[PDB]
Amino acid sequence: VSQVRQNYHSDCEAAVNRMLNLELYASYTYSSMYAFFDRDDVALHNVAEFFKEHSHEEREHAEKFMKYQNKRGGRVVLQDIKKPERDEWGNTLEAMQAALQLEKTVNQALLDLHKLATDKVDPHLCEFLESEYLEEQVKDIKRIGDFITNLKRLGLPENGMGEYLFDKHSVK
Amino acid sequence: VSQVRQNYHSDCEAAVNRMLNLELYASYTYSSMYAFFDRDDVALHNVAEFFKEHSHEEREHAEKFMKYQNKRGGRVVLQDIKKPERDEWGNTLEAMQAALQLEKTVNQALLDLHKLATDKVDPHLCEFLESEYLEEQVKDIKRIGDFITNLKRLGLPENGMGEYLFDKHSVK
Amino acid sequence: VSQVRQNYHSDCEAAVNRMLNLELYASYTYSSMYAFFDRDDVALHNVAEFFKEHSHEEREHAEKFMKYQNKRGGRVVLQDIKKPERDEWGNTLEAMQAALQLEKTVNQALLDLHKLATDKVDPHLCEFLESEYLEEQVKDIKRIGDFITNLKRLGLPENGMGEYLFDKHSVK
Amino acid sequence: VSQVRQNYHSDCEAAVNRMLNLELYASYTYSSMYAFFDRDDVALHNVAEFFKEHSHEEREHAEKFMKYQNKRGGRVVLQDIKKPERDEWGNTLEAMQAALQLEKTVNQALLDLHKLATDKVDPHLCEFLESEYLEEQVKDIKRIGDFITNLKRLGLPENGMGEYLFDKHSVK
Ligand SMILES: [Cl-]
Ligand SMILES: [Cl-]
Ligand SMILES: [Cl-]
Ligand SMILES: [Cl-]
Ligand SMILES: [Cl-]
Ligand SMILES: [Cl-]
Ligand SMILES: [Cl-]
Ligand SMILES: [Cl-]
Ligand SMILES: [Cl-]
Ligand SMILES: [Cl-]
Ligand SMILES: [Cl-]
Ligand SMILES: [Cl-]
Ligand SMILES: [Cl-]
Ligand SMILES: [Cl-]
Ligand SMILES: [Cl-]
Ligand SMILES: [Cl-]
Ligand SMILES: [Cl-]
Ligand SMILES: [Cl-]
Ligand SMILES: [Cl-]
Ligand SMILES: [Cl-]
Ligand SMILES: [Cl-]
Ligand SMILES: [Cl-]
Ligand SMILES: [Cl-]
Ligand SMILES: [Cl-]
Ligand SMILES: [Cl-]
Ligand SMILES: [Cl-]
Ligand SMILES: [Cl-]
Ligand SMILES: [Cl-]
Ligand SMILES: [Cl-]
Ligand SMILES: [Cl-]
Ligand SMILES: [Co+2]
Ligand SMILES: [Co+2]
Ligand SMILES: [Co+2]
Ligand SMILES: [Co+2]
Ligand SMILES: [Co+2]
Ligand SMILES: [Co+2]
Ligand SMILES: [Co+2]
Ligand SMILES: [Co+2]
Ligand SMILES: [Co+2]
Ligand SMILES: [Co+2]
Ligand SMILES: [Co+2]
Ligand SMILES: [Co+2]
Ligand SMILES: [Co+2]
Ligand SMILES: [Co+2]
Ligand SMILES: [Co+2]
Ligand SMILES: [Co+2]
Ligand SMILES: [Co+2]
Ligand SMILES: [Co+2]
Ligand SMILES: [Co+2]
Ligand SMILES: [Co+2]
Ligand SMILES: [Co+2]
Ligand SMILES: [Co+2]
Ligand SMILES: [Co+2]
Ligand SMILES: [Co+2]
Ligand SMILES: [Co+2]
Ligand SMILES: [Co+2]
Ligand SMILES: [Co+2]
Ligand SMILES: [Co+2]
Ligand SMILES: [Co+2]
Ligand SMILES: [Co+2]
Ligand SMILES: [Co+2]
Ligand SMILES: [Co+2]
Ligand SMILES: [Mg+2]
Ligand SMILES: [Mg+2]
Ligand SMILES: [Mg+2]
Ligand SMILES: [Mg+2]
Ligand SMILES: [Mg+2]
Ligand SMILES: [Mg+2]
Ligand SMILES: [Mg+2]
Ligand SMILES: [Mg+2]
Ligand SMILES: [Mg+2]
């Protein structure tokens, strides 16, 4: 047992490793979206940059779980980072819809980790999630939802002029 | 009778209390519009902020009537602030149309208070209204009318692209 | 169901609307106290300004609940803002006593909302209350209690010199 | 007839001269109060300075009526400035009570001049009074009333400690 370990259940340690992997999976999905929107036959560079920034954010979320694991005396165990579910993302609306579902998947995993930490009576892990993860997820979900509403209003997927307008006034 | 009171008719004092309540009612209506445009399924944040600012302005108009009442030696009497007439505001045009009618309602109440002050021969109250309230009402009514004209030109309520364009170039 | 909604119980959504209304009710009560202390026959302007500031604070607390409701995908539903329980507040001690009970009423409502969020297993709402509301309530309750102790020590309600001294050295 | 004169009734011209004299009479009364509070056996120097400042203000009000008279083509006609009604002013409360009645006397004269200007249909004179005189009178009356309330609360005229406290915290 690590000399620093105190009130840290093996189940929580394992779930933190799984959460780290999911953050990395999300980062990789966002990077795929960045690459898609940078294609010469897609060419929506403000949209591409939005997804690149989200890729960076998710990787930082992962690094923070690595640091957390070590601080508590757990051991980081890495697994393969699976490739994204799609190779091409259609258009800005389709990609934002996919991002919304990904953010809700991540949020559900965070909520499930919080349930586990509650069951094992780990207030440090609970507060870490509450103060460092759950509010940013809710903010990101709201932002992406707002974008989806606007893209539908702009006539996506059919209205290419609307798609151009979005790239030029909403993510600039 | 208050030691400061001079040339202040009971009827005017009461009408000032009623005017205070109407300013508060208007502030609350605008706050409702702010909340509607901040919804994830509406998502027009520059429009929401316009209404939030107008909510603030109306509350300041109310505070100034409270201060006026005390300066003249009248007594502030508060009543319930009624909830807005609608829970949802449709779209930017529908909301601006509602705001125009609200501003005209407030302006009519100010004009009616001025008639009363004239009848009771209260030049201080008349000038307060003339110099602190009536010109801002006319300016606000003109601004909202100009917005309505533009929203109709942009094809509201049917044209969602027009609604997006307005939010991005007229209230930014 | 809103596209952003996740782990947000209808009961919590409704209780957030009720909490918003209570914050607005508190703001309105404080504004009444401001107006009372600004009267020419009361004339304690540092006390009036203290209550005006608290009125502002409470309105900001309400706006933050509106924003919260939308972020979670709930719908803001407004009700009448009831007028304050009194039209006149007696003196500085009587008003501070009323403010203490109002702040404890608000705090009890926050604690009850936290119980509901706990029962429905909503850690985001729990942390929002814990980190954005509960500590400010405890601080405000302590400040007002400290003022009450000082006002009693100064001989309120009978000792007018004490009341003047308080206005000039404790809320300046 | 003056070459500049237009829509200026002889009655209004005469009433402006009488108003000028009353402003000068008020200035002189305030100067008497300044001198009283500067006496070695009274010795309330912040109170004395308050009245000195009001003396200055009233003299400026008079000069502005002189300038007004000439601008309209009327002729300034001066009369004796009568000495104040009292040679000694008792104490801070007695003096503030006298100042309140003086300010209300001046305000009544301004309101009466406004009635005359209304009857003779002189909008320039009406607006001059409304915008340059009536609001300052209401503000001054409110301030002095607030002081009277505080002086009574402090136990004047009997409570000398209260009188000292006022001079040190309310007019400093
Ligand atoms: Cl352990
Ligand atoms: Cl274990
Ligand atoms: Cl972050
Ligand atoms: Cl696998
Ligand atoms: Cl694919
Ligand atoms: Cl997903
Ligand atoms: Cl966070
Ligand atoms: Cl009156
Ligand atoms: Cl009356
Ligand atoms: Cl304004
Ligand atoms: Cl009713
Ligand atoms: Cl409705
Ligand atoms: Cl209306
Ligand atoms: Cl003006
Ligand atoms: Cl105005
Ligand atoms: Cl839900
Ligand atoms: Cl539910
Ligand atoms: Cl706050
Ligand atoms: Cl009811
Ligand atoms: Cl009452
Ligand atoms: Cl209460
Ligand atoms: Cl807090
Ligand atoms: Cl003439
Ligand atoms: Cl004539
Ligand atoms: Cl002046
Ligand atoms: Cl004589
Ligand atoms: Cl005498
Ligand atoms: Cl007099
Ligand atoms: Cl003025
Ligand atoms: Cl002291
Ligand atoms: Co993200
Ligand atoms: Co993440
Ligand atoms: Co990093
Ligand atoms: Co595979
Ligand atoms: Co995310
Ligand atoms: Co936080
Ligand atoms: Co984010
Ligand atoms: Co407005
Ligand atoms: Co208004
Ligand atoms: Co204000
Ligand atoms: Co109703
Ligand atoms: Co308005
Ligand atoms: Co003007
Ligand atoms: Co305005
Ligand atoms: Co408060
Ligand atoms: Co509050
Ligand atoms: Co605010
Ligand atoms: Co009622
Ligand atoms: Co409070
Ligand atoms: Co907890
Ligand atoms: Co917490
Ligand atoms: Co904190
Ligand atoms: Co506070
Ligand atoms: Co004066
Ligand atoms: Co004067
Ligand atoms: Co001069
Ligand atoms: Co004589
Ligand atoms: Co005066
Ligand atoms: Co004017
Ligand atoms: Co003015
Ligand atoms: Co003055
Ligand atoms: Co002191
Ligand atoms: Mg283990
Ligand atoms: Mg936003
Ligand atoms: Mg009455
Ligand atoms: Mg304009
Ligand atoms: Mg429900
Ligand atoms: Mg628990
Ligand atoms: Mg303290
Ligand atoms: Mg003549
Ligand atoms: Mg004052």
What is d(CA A74, CA A95) in angstroms, rounded to the nearest whole number? 36
State the Cα–Cα distance between residues B76 and C35, nearest whole angstrom. Answer: 7
With residue B36 as reference, give the H or E element that holds it.
Answer: helix B10-37
Provide the residue type at A57 as one letter. E
SS (H, E, C) chain C: CCCCCCCCCHHHHHHHHHHHHHHHHHHHHHHHHHHHHCCCCCCCHHHHHHHHHHHHHHHHHHHHHHHHHHHHCCCCCCCCECCCCCCCCCCHHHHHHHHHHHHHHHHHHHHHHHHHHHHCCCHHHHHHHHHHHHHHHHHHHHHHHHHHHHHHHCCCCCCHHHHHHHHHHCCC
Residue spans of the domains in chain D: they are: 1-172
Q: Tokens 């104040």 label which residue?
A: D84
Q: SS3 of B81, please?
A: strand
Looking at the DSSP bridge assignments, the partners of residue A133 are none
- Interchain CB distance below 8 Å, B75 and C39: yes
- Tokens 């009372």 sit at which residue? C36
C-alpha distances out from residue B119 to A152, B77, B113, D126, Å: 57, 23, 10, 16
Rounded CA-CA distance C71/C159 in Å is: 51
**What are chain A's partners, defined as 3 or more CB pairs within 8 angstroms?**
B, C
Tokens of D123: 């909008």
C55-77 b/e with 16+ CB inside 10 Å = b? bebbbebbbebbebbbbbbbbbb
The verdict on a CB contact (< 8 Å) between A165 and B160 is no
CA angle C135, C141, C147 (to 5 degrees): 140
Sign of CA dihedral D39, D40, D41, D43: positive
C81 bridge partner residues: B81
Query: Cα-atom radius of gyration of chain D, to the nearest Å?
Result: 18
Nearest chain C alpha carbon to B43:
C70
Q: Do D142 and B3 touch (CB under 8 A)?
A: no
> What SS3 class is residue B2?
coil
- 3-state class of B4 per DSSP? coil
| Cα–Cα dist C16/C13, whole Å | 5
Residues 6+ apart with CB under 8 A from B169: none
- List the structure tokens of A13: 């340690």
Of D109, B66, D113, the C-alpha closest to C52 is B66
DSSP state of A131: I
How far away is chain A from the Cα of C71, in angstroms, using its nearest Cα?
6
Distance of CA B130 to the CA centre of its chain: 16
Q: Are A9 and A122 in contact (CB under 8 A)?
A: yes
Q: What totals of helices (H) and strands (E) does chain A contain, helices first?
A: 6, 0
Q: B118 Cβ partners below 8 Å, 6+ apart?
A: B126
Beta bridge partners of B81: C81
- Give me B146's structure tokens: 């100009």
Q: In whole angstroms, give the CA distance from residue C9 to residue C26.
A: 26
Compute, in angstroms, the gap from residue C26 CA to the centroid of ligand 49: 7
Q: Are D4 and D70 in contact, with CB atoms under 8 Å apart?
A: no
Judged by CB atoms closer than 8 Å, whether chains meet at B42 and A149 is answered as yes
Q: Token pair of C137, please?
A: 């309530």
Name the CATH topology of C1-172: Ferritin (1.20.1260)
Which residue in this structure is represented by tokens 């009356």? D141
How far apart are the C-alpha atoms of D102 and C10, rounded to whole Å?
Answer: 65
Residue type, B14: A
Q: Which residues of C touch A107 (CB under 8 A)?
A: 6
State the helix-helix crossing angle for B45-72 and C10-37, rounded to 10 degrees.
30
Ligand lying nearest the CA atom of residue B75: 65
**What's the farthest any 2 CA atoms get from each other in chain D?**
61
Place of tokens 């409360």: D93
Q: Which two tokens stand for residue C8?
A: 């947000």
* Ligand lying closest to the C-alpha of residue A23: 32
Residue D74 Cα, ligand 30 centroid: separation in angstroms? 53
Report the residue of A144, A153, A164, A169 to disrupt the B interface, i.e. the one with the largest count of B CBs within 10 Å.
Answer: A153
Q: Would you give the distance in Å from CA B87 to the centre of its chain?
A: 18
Contact A80, A20 (CB under 8 A): no
**Non-local CB neighbours of B153 within 8 Å, separated by 6+ positions:** none
Chains D and A touch (3+ CB pairs under 8 A): no
3-state class of D47 per DSSP? helix
Chains A and C touch (3+ CB pairs under 8 A): yes
Q: Are C140 and C103 in contact (CB under 8 A)?
A: yes
Whether residue C144 contacts residue C138, with contact meaning beta carbons closer than 8 Å, is answered with no
Q: Which long-range contacts (CB under 8 A, 24 or more apart) does B135-141 make?
A: B137/B103, B137/B106, B137/B107, B137/B110, B138/B107, B140/B54, B140/B103, B141/B100, B141/B103, B141/B104, B141/B107
Burial of A157 (0-12, 13-18, 19+ CB in 10 A): middle
Gap between the terminal Cα atoms of chain A: 51
Q: CA D91 to CA D171: how far, in whole Å?
A: 15
One-character DSSP codes across A54-123: HHHHHHHHHHHHHHHHHHHT--------PPPS-S---SHHHHHHHHHHHHHHHHHHHHHHHHHHHHTT-H
> How far is the CA of D69 from the CAs of C115, D19, D105, D139, in angstroms?
74, 11, 22, 25
Tokens representing residue D29 in the block: 């009364």
Q: Are B16 and B117 in contact (CB under 8 A)?
A: no
Q: What backbone torsions phi and psi does residue C81 show, to the nearest 5 degrees?
A: -95, 110
Cis check for the bond before A84: say yes or no (omega within 30 of 0).
no
From CA D89, how far away is CA B1, in angstroms rounded? 25
Separation between Cα atoms, residue B3 and residue B80, nearest integer Å: 29
Tell me: is residue B61 an annotated ligand-binding position: yes
What is the residue-wise DSSP string for B85-154? Answer: S-S---SHHHHHHHHHHHHHHHHHHHHHHHHHHHHTT-HHHHHHHIIIIIHHHHHHHHHHHHHHHHHHHT
* Residue A121, burial from CB neighbour count under 10 angstroms (0-12, 13-18, 19+): exposed
Does the beta-carbon distance from C42 to D150 stay under 8 Å?
Answer: no
Per-residue tokens: B93:
């045009």
Residue C62 near residue C24 (C-beta atoms within 8 A): yes
- Report the alpha-carbon distance of residue D70 to residue D86 in Å, rounded: 34
Q: Which residues of C touch D155 (CB under 8 A)?
A: 160-161
Q: Measured between alpha carbons, how far is residue A43 from residues A46, A55, A88, A165, B145 in Å?
A: 9, 19, 13, 13, 39
> Is D100 in Cβ contact with B3 (below 8 Å)?
yes
Are the CB atoms for D143 and C38 separated by under 8 Å?
A: no
Centre of ligand 12 from the C-alpha of residue A94, in Å: 32
Q: How far apart are CA B28 and CA B36, in angstroms?
A: 13
CB-count burial class (<10 Å; 0-12, 13-18, 19+) for D14: middle
Distance, CA of B14 to CA of B76 (rounded, Å): 9
- Helical axes B10-37 vs C45-72, angle rounded to 10°: 30
Name the nearest CA neighbour of B128 among B78, B67, B170.
B67
- E-strand spans in chain D? none
| Separation of CA C131 and ligand 69 centre (Å) | 21
In which element (H, E) is residue B54 found?
Answer: helix B45-72
Distance CA A16, CA C147 (A): 48
> Hey, how many other C-beta atoms are within 10 angstroms of the C-beta on A4?
11
* Residue D49 to residue D54: CA distance in whole angstroms: 9
The secondary structure of D108-150 as a DSSP string is HHHHHHHHHHHHTT-HHHHHHHIIIIIHHHHHHHHHHHHHHHH
Query: What are the two backbone dihedrals, phi and then psi, of residue A90, each rounded to the nearest 5 degrees?
Result: 80, -75
Tokens 């309600």 -> residue = C157
Give the closest residue to D149 by CA, choosing from A144, C164, C21, B52.
Answer: C164
CA-to-CA dists, residue B156 to A160, B43, B47, B95, D101, angstroms: 20, 16, 15, 12, 62
Binding residues of C: 23, 58, 61, 103, 137, 140
What approach was used to elucidate this structure? X-ray
**Which residues of C does the annotation place in the binding site for Fe cation?**
23, 58, 61, 103, 137, 140
Query: Residue D65 is which amino acid?
Result: F
